[PDB]
Structure formats: C-alpha cells, structure tokens
C-alpha cells in the first residue's frame, strides 16, 4: 500500500489515442486518418516553404534564447489579433482588445475558461454545440465551468439544424456562455450560411450573451482567410464583445510547435490593460511564459510582406488538395460500385469527414484495412493522398457494401 | 457596464516584472539582476555551443513538425529521468518510474501540484521552505492545494537554520506533501551539507511525508551534475518515492525554449503505466501536447555522447565563471572602501547573492545607478561581467556606505 495504489487506469483519449494505435500496426498499408493533420499528395507531412525559410532567418540572425514576457512575443500577438480581426477593424484600430500568447489552440481555449472561472461572474455554464471536438467538454471541466448544449447537427440530414439551434439558443438563460466555431465546424464540416449567421448574432446580441469563438481552420473552410474570418468580424461590429482563441497548428503547419492565442475584445483600452494584467496573474503559475520557436516563425511569417503572400498562396494550395482528395474519393466509391449517397462527403468543408459509418464499421477498416479513425464516423480527408484514395474507397465499400 | 467593469488592475511579477521595469529605463549603464538568466562575459547572453550544433544536426535532417505524444518526446522523457536518477539507479533501471515532458519548470511543477490536487488522498497540505521561490506559492495555490511552512533560513547568521528545520519537519502531519529544492536553494544560495540531507532523509521517512523535489540547477551548484543531484537520489535510495520537477532552463540556456519533465517514483512499472494514464488525461485538456524544439534540442545533447561531453564542460564554464563574478564582487567591496562583511556573497552557490539589503537600499539602486534586483535583496550574480562588476561593488557600496 504505496501512494498511488489507487490510481486507476485511465483509458486513451478519443483523438489522440488513435494516433497511439496507428503506431504500432505493421501493415505497410495502413492510413492515420485520426488526428487532423495535412500530408502532401506522397501522404507525408508537409513543412510549409515560408516555414522553412522563416526558420532559415532565425538561424542566421543568431538569435537568443531568452524568456519572453508572461505574454508572449509582442509582434505575434498583435500579429494573430490583426489576423482575426482585419487590419480596418475599430476594434482593432482602437485598441479595444488583449491578446496573450497560447499553447496554441488547446492553451489558449483553457486559459480562457479559467479567466472566465475566475471572472466571468453572471453564469457558470458554457453551450457548446451538439456535436463538439471531444476536447472542449473536459477543457471546460477541468477549469471548473458547466457544460450545457445547444442543437446543432442533424444526422438525418447531414445538415445543420437552424431550426433546432435557433430554439434552443433562444431560450438559453441571458448572461451565459456560448461556444462558437468559427468555421469549418469540427467535426461535422458544416457552417451556418452567412445569412445563418446574421440572425445567430441578433439572438446572441439580444440574449446578452458570452460569445466564445474556438479558430482552429482560419484559411481551411473556403481557402480564403479574410472570408473565413467572417462571422467572428460580423458579430463584434454588431457590438458583441468576444472571446476568442487561435490556433496556428493546421494553417501553418506549426503542430507541435504549439503557437496560438487568447484574445478579449473589450470596451476600451484601459479596460484592456486591466483585464490584461489578470490573464498574465493567471499564466504566471501555469507555465511562467510561452514557447517562443512557434511564435517566433509565425510573426516572421505575419509581419514579412512577402512571406505573408507566399503563406497565402501556400493555404489555397492545402485547402485546393483537400477539395482534390474529397471529389476522387466519392467518384472512386462510384466506380467500386458503391449504392450509398456520398454527397456529403463533397459538400463537407474543413479537413474531415463525418461519413455516418457505425462503430462496427469502423472496427473492420481497422481491423481488415489498418485505416484509423475516430470512433464517431469523422475521417481526415487531409491526410489522404492520390495513392490511397482507391484504397479507401475500396475499404469504405467493401466494409458498407 | 460591459463584461469586464469589475476586473481591477492587478500588480505586475515580484519577479519577471523586473525584466519589464529593465527595459524601460534609458540609462545606457543600467543592469538586469533581477531574473536568474545567464550572461557571458561581454554581459550578453549565451547560447551554447553544443545547443547550437544541436540545432544545426536538426536542420539539416529535414525534421517535421508534427504533434508529439501527450507525455512528450521519448527519447526526451527517458533522457530526463536517467540525468535525474543517474544510470546505475535501480528505480530507473526497474522502470518504477514515469516521467513527462513539462513547459519547463512551472509547467511540471504545475501538472504534478494538479496531479496531486486530484490523486493526492492523504492531504492539500504542502510545506514550503522559509522562504522559497516566490512563485511556489500559487501554484499550489492555484492547483487547489494549501499551504505551510518549515523554517530554512536564518537571516541572523546568514545560514540554514537547521534547528528550526528539524523541529518543524519533525512535527509536520505525517503524509503531508513537503517540498524541497535539489540544490542551489532560491534564493538563499544555502544547501543543507550532505550529512545534514542525510538527517532530513529519516525524517521524511519516519513522517511519512511525501517528498516533492524541485530541480531547477542541477549542475549550477558544485559545477557536477551527478554530485548536484545527490540529496535526491540518497531519499530514493533509502526508500523514499519522491515526485520531482526538472528545468533545463539555466543548465541548457534553453529559457524561451521550455524544456522540462515531471517525475513520480512508482512501486512498480504496473504502477507506472496507470500513474502515467492519468498524468496524460490531465496534461490533454490543458495544453493538449509539449512544445517540440527544446525537447528535440535537449534529447539530441543528452543521447549524443559528444555533444553530452561538450556540455558537461560547458557547464562548468559557466559555474567558474560566476564563482570568478562573486570573488570580485567582494574585492571591489573591499577595494571601494566597504566596511560590512560581505562574506556571504562567497558562500552562497548557485545564480544569486542573498545580499541582506533593505527594500530603501533595492530603491535607490535602481533610481540612482539602474541596477534591477528583487525587492527581497536578491540579486543575479550570474548576470554580472568583467566589465561592470565594479560598477556594481560602487553602487553597493554607496547605498550601504
Ligand atoms: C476546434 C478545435 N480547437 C482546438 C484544437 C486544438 O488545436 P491545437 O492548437 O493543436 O491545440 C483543435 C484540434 N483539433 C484536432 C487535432 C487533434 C486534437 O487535438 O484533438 C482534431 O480534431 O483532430 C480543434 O479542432
Ligand atoms: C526553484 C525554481 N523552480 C522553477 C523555476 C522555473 O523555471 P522555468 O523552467 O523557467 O519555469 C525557477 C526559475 N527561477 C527563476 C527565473 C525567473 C522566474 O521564473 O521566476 C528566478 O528565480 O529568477 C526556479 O528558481
């Protein structure tokens, strides 16, 4: 009888843990379609060129290694805050905001809830959409706030159910929490449509709500990151003051570099410096200060004119790839002779699929085919490339036939 | 009245807001000794060698940025645990152990409080050292844990008051959580002798006490790194499992990179596994996954046995080097004209100087000469060069005259 002789075993994250999985399979075949991470069209991963010569930079200037302020790197933290919210912006213009260097989006998210725990005083409630990335539920949970739900998804459909979210929006109790995406909804690919999402924010506005908006895919839904950033921009110019958080894993490829960021949009600039020096009170204990390699890369790339271009150039040609992989793979299902309607695959947006598959479906692909994926039906699209897309396609038939 | 009218200004960092005050001031003569970061020298600062080549080995591999595991790079993690525990050990050797990568000393620090916060059943007492660095305190804090205290220094006799530790120690509630720094004691620069760790050894054991190391300096206390680590493997060698935290920080000028691992000792490897389930469902909803650069740095120094000889005498370069610092400091003393014995400037080992100056003394020194310390009289000697040590022992001097 030690100290953790009680200590159970817990079991692998959802995610995550396929990953875990996927690593130790010998079939030379085999796919991680797991995790959302992008492969080139070889099915390998893929280090964007304005990445490696931003790095080629940094090298030559010799740099420091230094510790950067509890904030972050200042160049990227108002680089990421002019990103989200466009270089015109009063919000920005004005000052009216804070943003903090995150451990990416997973920090940024869980630095948010525990700001929001310790000051947020009208409610203890977050909504998060029905579904959600498995994360944000023990996210919310571990930072002390409770979990509600709002109607979302519609699986007979495979359409958003306004009517539904609408409903239930329309009747959450005023001063609460609301999780946004974005864009490129995870993990079903589906947004509301920009005219969906201007009658959202008249509810959101008139409920007086706490919007929290999670940008994981800014340049993956459309391929555009100005037109992506869209609804995040309507709502704060029709006078809601987000929350929001960042990642720079998938747009600039920066994974385990970990890059993102925290963001508050308030009321004026000294009420930013204030709220300012809270969130620095709540990192300090955390983790002192942030990763400087991801941060260092992505401001060089944001604040570099011909980077940023190049950076642009380099997102469309991700997003294009995707599109590339989601039509070869509903037209391989046809030619394997498949009876099933795969439109959705098409219609979907982001870097997955929310394919339907039951779990005993899933088990098979596993099992017969090594190709993994979440347990819910969700793929990663991105990491298919033109040698396995008649692969998958024969596996998803045969296991659907 | 918006969302965030309520939050008030909260005060900037005792001690990472110096660096802020530092860099502010136009004086052309001015000196940061507030934070403990190593300075050449040229009073610049240092990245090593050995690190440099690393990174040159990972450049040119062509390396990818892809999501490391939750516990961190492998390689890194097994690295860690054997710099700590020593390659003979038989907690290493039998596996009884887990270790994960942390966001490097706070990070760790953090998710083992965290950890002990939900599995820690025997008591939220955790007893800190008169004093002790002063970010110990919220993060137990903020974990969820309370705090105590045992008596450590003596400011009468410029020493460890033993007596007072025994006494103390030896009343504490037996399975308390007590915590203890490896070497290199901040800020006092005082270490208990090896006879006296011996002591304190039974005295945990006799108590019962859960034993938390803190392992910032391993290497900046004699200029030996498995000396330096002796208190911590005499405990485990004696019965005690301890749980410790690792930086890399200082020893590998890795700062901005945030390099460090969390350990527990374990009963056995079975033990281990479900220890290390849970570390990892608690590490995903915070940051998800570890920063990658200072991992990869750090492992290709550890695994690489020219590069870990390199570093070793690198190490103690920068060991001789602040000893060189603090025996002119207290020549300059002597020679300006100082009639105080500063003695104690000699004595204490590691990055600072426990100076004993009063908070009117810290005050002017700043305002008149532009030397940045904390306000406690602890001030970074390590920081300190060739050039501007006499600057320094006349600042001293004429505040104290
Ligand atoms: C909506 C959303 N927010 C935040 C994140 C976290 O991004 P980081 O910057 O890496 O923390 C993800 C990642 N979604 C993923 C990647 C795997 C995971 O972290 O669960 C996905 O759905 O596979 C996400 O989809
Ligand atoms: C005992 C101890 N533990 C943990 C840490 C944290 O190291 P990181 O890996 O950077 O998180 C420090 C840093 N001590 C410092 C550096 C400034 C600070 O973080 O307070 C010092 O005392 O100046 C420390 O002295």
Same mark, same amino acid.
């Given at each position: 009888?030690?100290?953790?002789?009680?200590?159970?075993?817990?079991?692998?994250?959802?995610?995550?843990?396929?990953?875990?999985?996927?690593?130790?399979?010998?079939?030379?075949?085999?796919?991680?379609?797991?995790?959302?991470?992008?492969?080139?069209?070889?099915?390998?991963?893929?280090? #964007?060129?304005?990445?490696?010569?931003?790095?080629?930079?940094?090298?030559? /200037?010799?740099?420091?290694?230094?510790?950067?302020?509890?904030?972050?790197?200042?160049?990227?933290?108002?680089?990421?805050?002019?990103?989200?919210?466009?270089?015109?912006?009063?919000?920005?213009?004005?000052?009216?905001?804070?943003?903090?260097?995150?451990?990416?989006?997973?920090?940024? *998210?869980?630095?948010?809830?525990?700001?929001?725990?310790?000051?947020?005083?009208?409610?203890?409630?977050?909504?998060?959409?029905?579904?959600?990335?498995?994360?944000?539920?023990?996210?919310?949970?571990?930072?002390?706030?409770?979990?509600?739900?709002?109607?979302?998804?519609?699986? +007979?459909?495979?359409?958003?159910?306004?009517?539904?979210?609408?409903?239930?929006?329309?009747?959450?109790?005023?001063?609460?929490?609301?999780? *946004?995406?974005?864009?490129?909804?995870?993990?079903?690919?589906?947004?509301?449509?920009?005219?969906?999402?201007?009658?959202?924010?008249?509810?959101? +506005?008139?409920?007086?709500?706490?919007?929290?908006?999670?940008?994981?895919?800014?340049?993956?839904?459309?391929?555009?990151?100005?037109?992506?950033?869209?609804? *995040?921009?309507?709502?704060?110019?029709?006078?809601?003051?987000?929350?929001?958080?960042?990642?720079?894993? /998938?747009?600039?490829?920066?994974?385990?570099?970990?890059?993102?960021?925290?963001?508050?949009?308030?009321?004026?600039?000294?009420?930013? /410096?204030?709220?300012?020096?809270?969130?620095?009170?709540?990192?300090?204990?955390?983790?002192?200060?942030?990763?400087?390699?991801?941060?260092?890369?992505?401001?060089?790339? #944001?604040?570099?004119?011909?980077?940023?271009?190049?950076?642009?150039?380099?997102?469309?040609?991700?997003?294009?790839?995707?599109?590339?992989?989601?039509?070869?793979?509903?037209?391989?299902?046809?030619?394997?002779?498949?009876?099933?309607?795969?439109?959705?695959?098409?219609?979907?947006?982001?870097?997955?699929?929310?394919?339907?598959?039951?779990?005993?479906?899933?088990?098979?692909?596993?099992?017969?085919?090594?190709?993994?994926?979440?347990?819910?039906?969700?793929?990663?699209?991105?990491?298919?490339?033109?040698?396995?897309?008649?692969?998958?396609?024969?596996?998803?038939?045969?296991?659907?036939?």
């Amino acid at each position: 009888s030690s100290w953790w002789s009680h200590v159970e075993m817990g079991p692998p994250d959802p995610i995550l843990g396929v990953t875990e999985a996927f690593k130790r399979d010998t079939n030379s075949k085999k796919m991680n379609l797991g995790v959302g991470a992008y492969r080139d069209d070889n099915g390998k991963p893929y280090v #964007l060129n304005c990445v490696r010569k931003a790095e080629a930079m940094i090298a030559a /200037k010799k740099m420091d290694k230094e510790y950067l302020p509890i904030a972050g790197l200042a160049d990227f933290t108002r680089a990421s805050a002019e990103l989200a919210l466009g270089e015109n912006s009063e919000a920005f213009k004005s000052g009216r905001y804070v943003t903090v260097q995150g451990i990416s989006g997973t920090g940024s *998210l869980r630095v948010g809830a525990n700001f929001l725990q310790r000051f947020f005083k009208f409610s203890r409630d977050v909504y998060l959409p029905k579904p959600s990335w498995g994360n944000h539920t023990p996210i919310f949970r571990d930072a002390g706030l409770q979990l509600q739900a709002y109607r979302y998804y519609d699986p +007979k459909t495979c359409s958003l159910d306004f009517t539904g979210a609408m409903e239930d929006i329309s009747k959450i109790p005023e001063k609460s929490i609301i999780l *946004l995406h974005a864009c490129a909804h995870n993990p079903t690919g589906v947004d509301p449509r920009q005219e969906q999402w201007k009658e959202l924010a008249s509810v959101v +506005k008139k409920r007086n709500l706490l919007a929290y908006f999670d940008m994981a895919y800014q340049g993956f839904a459309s391929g555009d990151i100005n037109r992506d950033a869209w609804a *995040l921009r309507h709502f704060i110019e029709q006078g809601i003051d987000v929350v929001l958080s960042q990642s720079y894993a /998938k747009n600039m490829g920066l994974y385990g570099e970990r890059a993102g960021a925290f963001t508050v949009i308030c009321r004026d600039a000294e009420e930013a /410096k204030r709220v300012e020096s809270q969130l620095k009170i709540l990192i300090r204990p955390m983790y002192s200060n942030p990763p400087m390699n991801g941060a260092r890369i992505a401001s060089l790339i #944001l604040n570099t004119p011909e980077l940023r271009k190049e950076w642009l150039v380099e997102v469309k040609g991700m997003a294009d790839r995707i599109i590339s992989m989601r039509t070869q793979l509903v037209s391989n299902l046809k030619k394997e002779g498949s009876s099933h309607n795969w439109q959705h695959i098409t219609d979907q947006i982001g870097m997955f699929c929310f394919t339907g598959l039951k779990p005993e479906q899933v088990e098979r692909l596993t099992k017969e085919f090594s190709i993994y994926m979440t347990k819910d039906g969700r793929i990663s699209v991105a990491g298919v490339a033109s040698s396995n897309v008649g692969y998958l396609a024969h596996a998803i038939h045969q296991v659907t036939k």
